[PDB]
Design a protein around this ligand. Structure first.
Ligand SMILES: O=c1ccn([C@@H]2O[C@H](COP(=O)(O)OP(=O)(O)O[C@H]3O[C@H](COCc4ccccc4[N+](=O)O)[C@H](O)[C@H](O)[C@H]3O)[C@@H](O)[C@H]2O)c(=O)[nH]1
Ligand SMILES: O=c1ccn([C@@H]2O[C@H](COP(=O)(O)OP(=O)(O)O)[C@@H](O)[C@H]2O)c(=O)[nH]1
Ligand SMILES: [Mn+2]
Ligand SMILES: [Mn+2]
Lengths: 291, 281
C-alpha cells in the first residue's frame, strides 16, 4: 500500500549526511551509520507488511553465562516494536535463563551437540544455522540476524540493518588498508584472499539478511570449511575467514558500521562513532573456551 | 560469485562525495559520479543476463527527435548489455533506420495521437501500463521511461537499475520543498501540502522493474482520470502525479540531475561531474 502522510525534515541534496565517513559502497550498498537514516520512515515502511526478524545466538558450554544480559538488553534495544523470534542454540536447554519478553516476541531453544574444540564450536555455527534454515527459519521468520553471545546491546539496533544480505565492519580494521586485513593468506585454503583484493574486513560476530541469503551464506561457509578440513587446513580466523571470502565474492546489499560491533575497553568512544549499539562484554578467553 | 577483480579499496573514513547527499533518509542510494565502480556493477549485472527495456514516445512531430535519441542511446545507454527499445508512435513508417549494436533491438508500437500536448504527455502513463501487460512483463526485466526530445552525452548504465527509481529534476535539486512545483490544490489527486515532500522528481526519466513500473503508471493514470472527472488538471500533468506517487512509495534509488539536464537553461555547475542525458533545443 501507500505510506501515510508524515512530517519530517526535508533531505537536503547539497548537504552530505556524513562528512567524515563513507556512507555507500562502490556497489551502491548503504553503509549504515547514525545520521544516514530517518528511523520513522523506515519503521513505517517496515510495517507496510507483517515481517518477523529472527535472531540466532549460540550458548554452548560455559557461554550460557552470557545469555541473561544478551537477552535482557536485546529486549531493550533490538527491533523494538517489531515481531522478534529468538533462537538460542545450546547443549544445555535447562540453562537458558527465563527472560521476560515484550508482546510479539518469542524465544525458542534449539538443542545441539557441543564440540570439544572452541574452534569447532565457532565454525560449526555455519552448519547449524544452515541446517536450521531448512528445519525452521524459512517457515518462521523473514530475516535472520546472526550474532555472538558474548555481547550486549547498548543502543538502537533496528530495521535500518535489514536487507537481503549484510555484513558488519570489524571494529579493529575499519580504518585499515586491505593489506593489513587478517584475511586467510594461504592459497591452499578455500578462504584465501590475495593481498591486492578485499573491500572491507567483516566481523564474524554480526551478519545477516533474508533467510534465503543467510542459508546460502552459511551453507557455503560450511562447505568451504569441510573442504579445508579434508585438505588438512584450518583458516587463520576460522568462520570469520570464510565469511570474508564469501562476502568478497557475494557483495552485501548493506554494510553495517562499527557502531554495530564494538569493544569500548579496547577502542574507547571515537568521534566517528555517534552511537555504540552492540558491544563486547568482559570475559576470560582461556577459561571460558575450555573445560 | 564474482571473479577476482583488482580495483581501488573503498576508504571507510573518506566520503565518496563531500558536496552532495549520496543516500536518502530511507537508505536509497542517490546516484552521482563517484558513488559507484561501474566495473563491479557490470559484473554483477552481466551474471544475471539482464534485458533492459527503454520506452520513448514519438507522437506526431516528435518523430523528428528519434534519430539523435537512438544514435546517442547506442553510444551511451547500457552498452554491453541486452537492450530492447520500444518506440510508441502514430507514424510507424517515420521511425528512422538506426543500426544497432549486437544484443540490441527495437520494436515499434503503434498508438493513437492526442491533439493536446498535455494529453500526449499524460497518456504515456496509460500506454506504458497497458503494454506492461501486453509485452513488457514477458520481454524485459527493467523498464526505463524517458522523454524523446533528448540526447545521451555520457554514460547511463546499470548503476540506475533497481526496483523503482525517480530522477531529481534539474531545476529544483537545490530548492526547499515549499518552492517545489507540486500540485497544491487539495481538489487534485496529485495534491502535496507545503510541509511534505522529499524531492521534486522529473517526469522525463523514471523506471524500475516491470512490476513496479506497471504499478506506478497504472496508479498515475487512475489518479489523472479521477482528476478529469473532478474537472481539474494537475499543474504539471503526469509529472505532478509521478511526484505524488513517489512521495508515498519511496524509490529504491534516486538519480542525480547528471541524468536529466538542460545546459542551455542551467549551464554546467561544479557539482555536476558529468552531463549524461540532456535536453535538445
Ligand atoms: O506532440 C508530442 C508531445 C509530446 N510527446 C512526448 O511527450 C514527451 C513530453 O513532452 P515534452 O517533451 O514536450 O514536455 P517538456 O516540456 O519537455 O516536459 C518535460 O520537461 C518539463 C521540465 O522542463 C525542463 C526545465 C524546466 C524548468 C527549469 C529547468 C528545466 N530544465 O530541464 O533545465 C517537465 O519536467 C515535464 O514533466 C517533462 O516531461 C515528449 O518527450 C515526447 O516523448 C510527443 O511524442 N509528441
Ligand atoms: O565454547 C564456546 C565457544 C564459542 N561459542 C559461541 O561462538 C561464538 C564465538 O566465539 P567467541 O566469542 O569466544 O570468539 P571471538 O570472536 O570473540 O574471539 C561465541 O560468542 C558463542 O556464541 C560457544 O557458544 N561456546
Ligand atoms: Mn565473541
Ligand atoms: Mn521533453
Amino acid at each position: 500500500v501507500s505510506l501515510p502522510r508524515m512530517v519530517y525534515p526535508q533531505p537536503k541534496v547539497l548537504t552530505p549526511c556524513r562528512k567524515d565517513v563513507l556512507v555507500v559502497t562502490p556497489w551502491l550498498a548503504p553503509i549504515v551509520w547514525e545520521g544516514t537514516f530517518n528511523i520513522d520512515i523506515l519503521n513505517e515502511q517496515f510495517r507496510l507488511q507483517n515481517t518477523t526478524i529472527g535472531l540466532t545466538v549460540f550458548a554452548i558450554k560455559k557461554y550460557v553465562a552470557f545469555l541473561k544480559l544478551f537477552l535482557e538488553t536485546a529486549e531493550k534495544h533490538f527491533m523494538v516494536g517489531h515481531r522478534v523470534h529468538y533462537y538460542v542454540f545450546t547443549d544445555q536447554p535447562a540453562a537458558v535463563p527465563r527472560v521476560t519478553l515484550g508482546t510479539g516476541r518469542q524465544l525458542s531453544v534449539l538443542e545441539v551437540r557441543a564440540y570439544k574444540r572452541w574452534q569447532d564450536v565457532s565454525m560449526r555455527r555455519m552448519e547449524m544455522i544452515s541446517d536450521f534454515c531448512e528445519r525452521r527459519f524459512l517457515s518462521e521468520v523473514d530475516y535472520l540476524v546472526c550474532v555472538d553471545v558474548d555481547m550486549e546491546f547498548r543502543d538502537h539496533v533496528g530495521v535500518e540493518i535489514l536487507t537481503p544480505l549484510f555484513g558488519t565492519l570489524h571494529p579493529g580494521f575499519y580504518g585499515s588498508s586491505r593489506e593489513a586485513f587478517t584475511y586467510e593468506r594461504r592459497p591452499q585454503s578455500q578462504a584465501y584472499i590475495p593481498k591486492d583484493e578485499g573491500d572491507f574486513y567483516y566481523g564474524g560476530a554480526f551478519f545477516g539478511g533474508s533467510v534465503q541469503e543467510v542459508q546460502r551464506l552459511t551453507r557455503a561457509c560450511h562447505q568451504a570449511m569441510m573442504v579445508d578440513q579434508a585438505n588438512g587446513i584450518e583458516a587463520v580466523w576460522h568462520d570469520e575467514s570464510h565469511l570474508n571470502k564469501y562476502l568478497l565474492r557475494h557483495k552485501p546489499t548493506k554494510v553495517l558500521s562499527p557502531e554495530y560491533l564494538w569493544d569500548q575497553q579496547l577502542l574507547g568512544w571515537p568521534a566517528v562513532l555517534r552511537k555504540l549499539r552492540f558491544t563486547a562484554v568482559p570475559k576470560n578467553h582461556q577459561a571460558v573456551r575450555n573445560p
